[PDB]
C-alpha cells in the first residue's frame, strides 16, 4: 500500500538546485530524510542523467546541502532522491524530521530504512 519509506514534510525554506555551472531558485514543496519536492523552474535546462545538488537555506546559520538525483518530473514538479550528504547536513535534516515527526519509534524506523536502502 504505502511505497514511501520516509515521511514527507511540508516545508518551504529558500532553496536552490545546482548542476555543474547552472543554478535555479526553486520553490520547495516538501522535504524528507531522503529527498525533496520542488517546483519546476522556468529555465529548466536540467540533465536528468547527471547528478544535481540541492541547498536548503533554513536560516543564517543552517544550510542543508545534498547531492541529489532526479527521480521523476510531472505536472511542473521535480522529485529528487538524496545520494551523498555531508555529516553536518544530514544532522540538521535528521533534526528537522525528528522535530516534525514527534515520535521516536517513527524516527527509528526511518533511520533503519536509511541504512538498509543499499542492502
Amino acid at each position: 500500500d504505502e511505497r514511501r519509506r520516509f515521511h514527507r514534510i511540508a516545508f518551504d525554506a529558500d532553496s536552490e538546485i545546482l548542476q555543474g555551472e547552472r543554478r535555479w531558485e526553486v520553490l520547495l514543496h516538501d522535504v524528507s530524510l531522503h529527498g525533496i519536492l520542488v517546483g519546476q523552474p522556468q529555465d529548466w535546462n536540467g540533465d536528468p542523467q547527471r547528478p544535481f545538488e540541492a541547498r536548503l537555506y533554513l536560516g543564517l546559520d543552517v544550510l542543508i546541502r545534498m547531492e541529489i538525483s532526479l527521480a521523476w518530473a510531472r505536472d511542473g514538479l521535480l522529485g529528487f532522491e538524496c545520494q551523498h550528504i555531508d555529516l553536518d547536513s544530514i544532522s540538521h535534516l535528521r533534526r528537522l524530521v525528528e522535530l516534525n515527526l514527534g515520535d521516536e519509534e517513527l524516527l527509528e524506523r526511518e533511520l533503519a530504512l536509511l541504512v538498509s536502502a543499499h542492502d
Partner: protein, 273 residues
C-alpha cells in the same frame, strides 16, 4: 597506525551504506558521539564496531546512525543572552512580582547545555542578590524522548563538550570530575532544572506559565505556518510582560500584537503583550 585505519573503514561504511560523507579531522567528533553506544554494546574500538555492524546488524546500524547524526549544543551560546538575563531581565521581573517564583522554559533543550547554562547563570545572579528570589527560579527543559534527552538528564559531558564555551572558573564552580575526561553538573545546578519529554508540536498546557521562554535556533526546522503556530502557542505559556529569546541570528518578524521586539543593548528579546 592501527587506530587510523579503523576510522577509514568507518568512513567508508558511512559512505557505502547511508550515503553519509564524513570528511577528515572528524575522528575526535566520531569518538565522542559514539562513546556511550560503544560502552553499552561492550565495543572497545572503532574497528570492532565496524565489523560488528555489518555482520550482526539487528538494529545496531540504526543506532550508529542515530548517535552519529545527533548535533551538539554549545555552552552559553552567544554569551550576551545570559548577561542580559542577569543584568537586565531578572532584576526587572524580580522588581515586578516581589520575589515570587520565576519559571523559565528551555524549549528543545537537546543535550542540555542551554538549561544548565541558565541554571549556572541563575546561581551567579543569586550569589550577588541574596533574598531577591524568595521562591527561587524553576527551569523546565523539554525535548523529544530519545538519546539526547536521556544524556541531558544525566548531566554528564566529555572532553569535547567541555573544551568550548565553558570557562575554567565555571568548570570548578559547577562541575564534578567523574573519571578521565568526564564531568558532571553539581547537584546545585541540576536540581533547579526539570526535564520533560515534550515536542514543540505537542500541547504546552501541561507546562504552565513562564516569565521567560528560551526557544533558540530551533524554529528554523519548521515551515512558515508551523512556526507561526508554535510562536502563538508559546505566547499562551508566557505571563504578560514575560520575555521570549530566539537566538542571535533569528528575528521574529511576525505577530506584532502578541510580541513587542525590545533592544537590550547587545541583543533582542520579545515581550509578551
Amino acid at each position: 597506525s592501527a587506530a587510523n585505519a579503523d576510522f577509514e573503514l568507518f568512513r567508508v561504511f558511512l559512505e557505502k551504506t547511508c550515503g553519509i560523507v564524513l570528511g577528515s579531522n572528524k575522528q575526535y567528533l566520531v569518538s565522542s558521539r559514539l562513546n556511550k553506544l560503544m560502552e553499552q554494546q561492550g565495543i572497545k574500538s572503532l574497528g570492532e564496531l565496524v565489523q560488528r555492524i555489518q555482520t550482526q546488524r539487528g538494529g545496531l546500524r540504526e543506532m550508529v546512525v542515530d548517535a552519529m547524526t545527533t548535533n551538539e549544543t554549545l555552552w552559553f551560546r552567544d554569551t550576551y543572552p545570559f548577561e542580559v538575563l542577569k543584568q537586565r531581565v531578572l532584576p526587572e521581573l524580580i522588581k515586578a512580582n516581589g520575589g515570587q517564583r520565576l519559571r523559565i522554559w528551555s524549549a528543545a533543550c537537546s543535550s542540555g547545555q542551554e538549561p544548565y547554562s541558565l541554571s549556572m547563570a541563575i546561581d551567579e545572579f543569586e550569589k550577588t542578590n541574596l533574598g531577591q528570589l524568595k521562591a527561587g527560579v524553576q527551569i523546565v527543559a523539554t525535548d523529544l524522548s530519545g538519546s539526547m534527552l536521556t544524556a541531558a538528564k544525566a548531566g554528564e559531558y566529555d572532553t569535547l563538550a567541555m573544551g568550548r564555551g565553558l570557562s575554567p572558573e565555571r568548570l570548578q564552580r559547577y562541575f564534578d570530575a567523574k573519571g578521565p575526561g568526564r564531568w558532571a553538573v553539581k547537584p546545585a545546578i541540576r536540581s533547579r532544572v526539570e526535564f520533560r519529554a515534550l515536542n514543540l508540536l505537542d500541547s504546552y498546557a501541561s507546562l504552565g506559565k513562564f516569565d521567560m521562554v528560551f526557544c533558540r535556533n530551533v524554529l528554523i526546522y519548521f515551515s512558515a505556518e508551523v512556526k507561526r503556530d508554535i510562536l502563538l502557542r508559546i505566547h499562551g505559556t508566557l505571563k504578560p510582560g514575560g520575555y521570549l529569546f530566539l537566538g542571535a541570528s533569528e528575528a521574529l518578524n511576525n505577530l506584532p500584537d502578541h510580541y513587542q521586539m525590545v533592544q537590550c543593548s547587545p541583543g533582542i528579546i520579545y515581550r509578551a503583550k
